[PDB]
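Ticket #4471: complex job returned nothing on first submit. Input attached below:
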Amino acid sequence: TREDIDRKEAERLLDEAFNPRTKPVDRKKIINSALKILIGLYKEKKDDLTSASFISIARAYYLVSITILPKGTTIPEKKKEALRKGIEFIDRAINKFNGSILDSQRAFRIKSVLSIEFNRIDREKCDNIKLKNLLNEAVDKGCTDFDTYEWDIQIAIRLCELGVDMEGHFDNLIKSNKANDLQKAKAYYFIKKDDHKAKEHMDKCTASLKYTPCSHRLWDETVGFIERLKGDSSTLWRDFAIKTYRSCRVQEKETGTLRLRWYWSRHRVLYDMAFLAVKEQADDEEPDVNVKQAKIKKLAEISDSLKSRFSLRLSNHEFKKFLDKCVTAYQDGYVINKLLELTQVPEGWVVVHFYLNKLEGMGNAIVFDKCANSWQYKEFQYKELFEVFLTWQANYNLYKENAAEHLVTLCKKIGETMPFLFCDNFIPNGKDVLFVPHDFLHRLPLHGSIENKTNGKLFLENHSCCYLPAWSFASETSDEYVLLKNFDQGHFETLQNNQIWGTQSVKDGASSDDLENIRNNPRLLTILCHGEANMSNPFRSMLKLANGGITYLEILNSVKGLKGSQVILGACETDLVPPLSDVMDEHYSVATALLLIGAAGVVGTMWKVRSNKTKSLIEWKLENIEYKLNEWQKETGGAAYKDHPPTFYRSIAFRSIGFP
Amino acid sequence: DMNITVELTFFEPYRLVEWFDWDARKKSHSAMRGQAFAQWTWKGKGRTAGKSFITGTLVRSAVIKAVEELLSLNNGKWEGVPCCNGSFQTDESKGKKPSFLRKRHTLQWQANNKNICDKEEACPFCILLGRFDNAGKVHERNKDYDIHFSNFDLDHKQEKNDLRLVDIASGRILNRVDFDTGKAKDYFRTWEADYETYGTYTGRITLRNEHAKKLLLASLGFVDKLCGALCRIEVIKSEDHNDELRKQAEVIVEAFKQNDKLEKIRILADAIRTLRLHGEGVIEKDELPDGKEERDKGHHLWDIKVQGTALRTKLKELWQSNKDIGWRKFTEMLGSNLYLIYKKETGGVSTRFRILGDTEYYSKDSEGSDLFIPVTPPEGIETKEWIIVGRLKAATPFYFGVQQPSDSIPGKEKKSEDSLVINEHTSFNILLDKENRYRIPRSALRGALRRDLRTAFGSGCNVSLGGQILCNCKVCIEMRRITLKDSVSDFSEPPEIRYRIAKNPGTATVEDGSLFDIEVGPEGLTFPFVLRYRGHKFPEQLSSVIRYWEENDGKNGMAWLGGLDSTGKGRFALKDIKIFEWDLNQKINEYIKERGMRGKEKELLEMGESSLPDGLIPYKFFEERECLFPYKENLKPQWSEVQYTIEVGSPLLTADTISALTEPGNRDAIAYKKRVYNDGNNAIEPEPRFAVKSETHRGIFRTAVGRRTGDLGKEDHEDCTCDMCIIFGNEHESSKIRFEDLELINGNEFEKLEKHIDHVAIDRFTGGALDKAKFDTYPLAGSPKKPLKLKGRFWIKKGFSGDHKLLITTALSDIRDGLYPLGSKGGVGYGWVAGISIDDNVPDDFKEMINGPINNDYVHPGHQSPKQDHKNKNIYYPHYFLDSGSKVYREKDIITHEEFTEELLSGKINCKLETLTPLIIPDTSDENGLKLQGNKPGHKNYKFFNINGELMIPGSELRGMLRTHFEALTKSCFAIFGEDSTKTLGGKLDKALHPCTGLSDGLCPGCHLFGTTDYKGRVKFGFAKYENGPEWLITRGNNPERSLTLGVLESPRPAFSIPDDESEIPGRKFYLHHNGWRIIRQKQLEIRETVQPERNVTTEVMDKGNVFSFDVRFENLREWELGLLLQSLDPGKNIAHKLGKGKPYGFGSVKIKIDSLHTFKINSNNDKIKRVPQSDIREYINKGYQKLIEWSGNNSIQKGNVLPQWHVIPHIDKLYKLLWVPFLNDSKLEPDVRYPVLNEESKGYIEGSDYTYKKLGDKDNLPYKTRVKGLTTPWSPWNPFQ
RNA sequence: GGGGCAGAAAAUUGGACGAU
RNA sequence: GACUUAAUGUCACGGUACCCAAUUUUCUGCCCCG
Ligand SMILES: [Zn+2]
Ligand SMILES: [Zn+2]
Ligand SMILES: [Zn+2]
Ligand SMILES: [Zn+2]
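Support reply: We reran it on our side without changes. The output follows.
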């Protein structure tokens, strides 16, 4: 009494895979086997197959879609394709029916959940009206048993979200056990329309979010709920966005590196909404003065947490294998197997934190003054600045020497769009400034800004500037002035004759092994190789030594003898990183790599520089190490932008990256 | 206003996209992708036919880009009048944005017009831009347009119906290939339309000004790439035949099914497809292979009566009825229809649906973030255009994959998701034009160039689709300045068919469901090659790649473009490179007069330098190979070649089984052949050259490495980083080593290069040939004294570690010693490798890396019946029977071929075969090898079996005789048995003794060692070679002094062996040892007269004392099995074997002496050759004897280490009595062993011994049971019966 | 007084890692 | 002159149908009574 073509084996397999008694790692292969069995059965009987097999196929497709996570910022195509195939199979099953009650209820349940997932992923193909009609028809069919399946819970919550009234099913929805706290909060907000029970429930939901990894649907549901609460002009989203940002930070502290690159990078919207939440307080209404500064300090703290976290995570061959895995993961490939406070700054120093508000299309600049112990902030726009930066980059990548006019235009645009860099109240005159830019301002030279006046003045002529990718790079011996040179052209015969060094300087033909074996922690290291920065795959950057040695990963692996050192290098080093940064805020230059291994200060060049400028800098540096770069740049002729653009172009390319 | 008319001509296949005005475009991704393609509109319902056109906006954009580039060269001072920069910017608040937004880099210059452009006065650039006009963003009337661009309409000759989209365009699937894996990630489908007939468009501009006419006219001749193809614009002053073939295929199917031969129609359809290469003469003058001479039925395939008449006549009438449609189309349609009807009758259509794949991703997300990036080149460096012309030659059979011609239909390429497809006759297809000419698509060439440039630069990016800002990496920057052209050859002959299979690593047999064919093109074919670079200076990397693709004396071209690159398919060499230079700063007028060199590149290639057009100059600054830094540092060291010559001292055979049914000869298997196209003579070849497919090379190397390292036995390769998955690749990575074909290079030193070898299966009971169990083999003549040299190469990618090179060298060495044979029938001595030789051109690391007789002393007492009656007067029967009753041992678990197990042993045995009586082995290739048919018609003259003029014993005979001895020794099943009428013969046999069928019930010792149909054997035999002796037993009185004329040899009759059905089958049949050949020798003068010259044969006859040497190779053997094989090779003294013709007459006695046995072990460090002295051998026979005793069921002999007495087991005792020679050790025993003739008064009568069948089987005396008892008991006297 | 066997049995496509 | 474009802005010459698989396994050119 058994049919020759039965699908009970696949139904049992899917039922066993449904319950949370199976390993997450082993869930995919078994459901793939069940799908293979079902597809073979479908191929055996083309169009005479029964409806129940189609229902099981659609269920398997829905599950295979839910077992796929949205890595990065772009969702993989396999999830969308699986949903499309599942909805097509469910439509085919619905069109012709044998006639049943449970079969129809299950078919409409699967169709409804597939449509909900499809609309959540994209709204263009499945608009809100068709989803509303389909879901209303499904709820008419009678799928309201809330104590058995969570798909009905999802149907009810989405029905509440869409607009219709469900005042009748509220008590049985609340009495159900399968629903979680976020769904309870949505039900309390969209039916009872009260703000206390929903607050408590989603507060417990947020408190339970500290252990969920950054791959569950719960993060996306929380983001969407808070976004809709913001959209309805509610007065209930600021604090909850703050606490979900706290939970996101806590989970961020307990995640892997590849997962930090793939799955954690889609929480920029969460880090932005919480930034807006804090920015909404400290406003026209006047509380005590100290809470203003506390709120601004919190704003700087949250803007700091979105900075370069991948680089902060940095027996010999294990590290090399990990670095190869990281670099092969950067190109969307397969990877087959004691913190300083924001206040602790030296006296006479001002720190500027940059954050590009992507949600509102605005820029924020937070400033802390040590002498006054004051916190200030200002806003600006960055669209035309981005356009001029891209124009300069495009011209330089093609001509590399006649784009000085574009550099002057970019400096003038920076001065125009940021008028607070010259204000007395914002940044005091005769002070030292520190820059922590964000997401495209690393490439712009902020020490070349010209104010919009009759005869503008550079930013260097009054302030000395320093650079730092993030505040996490700030911390808190010998006297050998080691030198490494590989300049084949010559023109440095007047430098090697100095006796300030000894027993470690490779005057000619310096190679990678000459730098790998350094162990004295020198006070000053000088490298005079060729730059040849790499745009695509910035993990090489090809620091051209003799044998073509240390590019960018040998720095992170093969050198461990430059802790507390100051390194000045003449080559295209600190920039020519891709204009389009990344899916997350990161800086990838070998200057940053040198800063990562333990070096104190690094002087790098923003683009190609001449031999004369490097020779002048290295000769003027060793006279007394306490001089900064601003005086040398001012005396070199960097104030000649109007008459000779090329000399200004050559002079500005140097940059300091070390915070003392 | 002059109303100028512009006519557009294409020179490359352009692209088509269905038309959606502005809102339906956002819904369909295909329309959004193809904004810059030709547009197709439907005219009438049914989606059958329509019209094609090119929008005026695309032409306007092309003209705007043209004027931008033209003014950038002259600093905006075209013909003396300044020009401004333009705007190219629209504010979204004050006015509506244009329908198309810009993403490229706008070229800008210094504003030298000293004025601001308005309606009153403006530069010609503003007038062409339409910046200041009465019309904008809304079309109301045509009079206000200062500049206009009307739509362009196609020009067609036939206008009875509409354009009928089917013949104008053909859809195809393009691809995206990831760099570091070599596999595709996504695909997309576009329509391509031909240019030979539908490639002309016409339209009007209707310019209402004369100030900018001089710029507009010059800008017309500057646009080159429009609608995805090269172009120039200048001004002007039958499915009914399918139905009939389907009905005829149906009647052919019914006729084939009526004869219970349904499965042969697949091979019939394949042969019909193969016949497409031959002309109509193969069916006109009846050139199809015929049947065997003097046979009732002819060919087993071409002589099947279909509706009474033969198949050839029906095919002739079918071709005559459908002569109009052509020969190629008729053959292809007949094959496809036959395949479809056969599949429908079988019960499946092979839908082949895909799960969680088939990603079709289009570049999508440009609503915001609009930018305008100006690029201002300096007033210095000039811009020049370089044109590169040459020819591409295929050094290997190329392959460009396309989808089946059912999904390539324009209008219905895809209906919806979950649309099961139908597999056509051929799984893999090749790209062809509408004239059936080979094509190298621009997409494949551009992708190959992109990959090569990325490798040469040393860094690059994966292509990003839908990017907001242009890529600024070096590879994209250099590729944006490169223009290529499609290449079409002048060759239209049909492609070849190459077959591929897969082998199960466990049973060493074919895999269930692995059989497919690939269409490949000929080698030596020529294709055009045009490259254009527009830039400031010629890149060094591009020139390095050009030199890398070039072929000269001492260097081979390396241009891996196409598919199936692992099997060495798609290697190209570019020759006849000529680089010319266009000066675009001072010679722009001449570049305008002739529109570059578009559409006339062939003429440029052919003409000399004296008739070069003005403006073009030869480029003499092209760099050499050794002077480029990108080359020899990043490009040259990528692939390293390793070539060698393989010497085969055996008849290598690579069967095809399909060309045999289309060529004369009537032979089952014919060696593989290839067709190569010649350049000087535009034909193919006077004679094809034999070769071995690269797939066999790759499989041999891959299985050698897998068995070396043991990764072949893993059940899965998910997340695998093993040796096999790294060197040879998997379904997620491309192979790191590429193999090429093995071509035969010394075929001109052979006369009769190919040999004819026959084969037969012998029944175990009847002792004769089995019904329908005869076949022939047609391999290449391989001999130890003259071997075949095959030259082949494989390429190694840069990045190999020391362990992988070690593995490759060990695999090559293990090929050298002769463990993996080439071709088929390796178990009988076909395609055995004698050695390899590596020339002095491989890398130095590889070249330095690659570099007492045994006696049994066992005697047998023998029978007493001839021993006591030692003088004379005793006649014995020529053959007796051995009876092992019912017990057969089935071995449930099976020794796998996946790896060399640590407990089992493998090695080689060298054996010597010496004769006891003269031997007969015929060379049946020719029927008259001595030329005696001139005087006596109908006589069969045979020589000894020889290859290239030396005597040699085939290995199949030795394998069969040892297999029979082993089967009788180990009490196994009857491997060969005839279940036919005299119940039937199969009913008499016990069920347990039936031949092994399937691996479910196990394998008997005989089938587990020598092998069965679903399990390859572990013992391989080789051809025996002659060394010494006295040859050609001389008899005075015959026309040849070395020939013997035998008697009548009639078929065996089981009726005498088994009487009426109360009896039981006796078992195996064995022949006695006796010097009965002298009786035939002394009556030649009587046998040549009393016997008609039709029922006897004359063959060259050898002599006693002649020694042959043959070897036996074995792998993965247990200890007792090896001991049993050693005992079967020689059972001791006074016991020998029988082999050859004339066994009943005592004409095949041979003694096998074991010389040496080497054992080699592989789970050791690398390998080692041992000697295995006599002690280990004796231990092995002792173990075999213990195994036999355990099989006997009772421990008659206690455990111990003593000389084994084989005469304790009854069946062993009987077998050794059956093989006992009575005349070896100086014994005067001369037994007489013959047959009763028929009756009295018959030739050969004894005349007084009553030794006749009349008194022997009359049932009055000598009852049936006594007759079977006498036949069963060996050496029982018959004339004095018991 | 007489010649038989001269190919038979299978495979005729499967699959194509995206992160608990 | 519709069907068939919109005009101060079209890198689609922005994308190799690519990757994986031994035409192979078993067989003596042998053989006598109506
Ligand atoms: Zn103008
Ligand atoms: Zn690029
Ligand atoms: Zn593997
Ligand atoms: Zn068997």
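Residues 239-349 of chain B form one domain. Closing as resolved unless it happens again.
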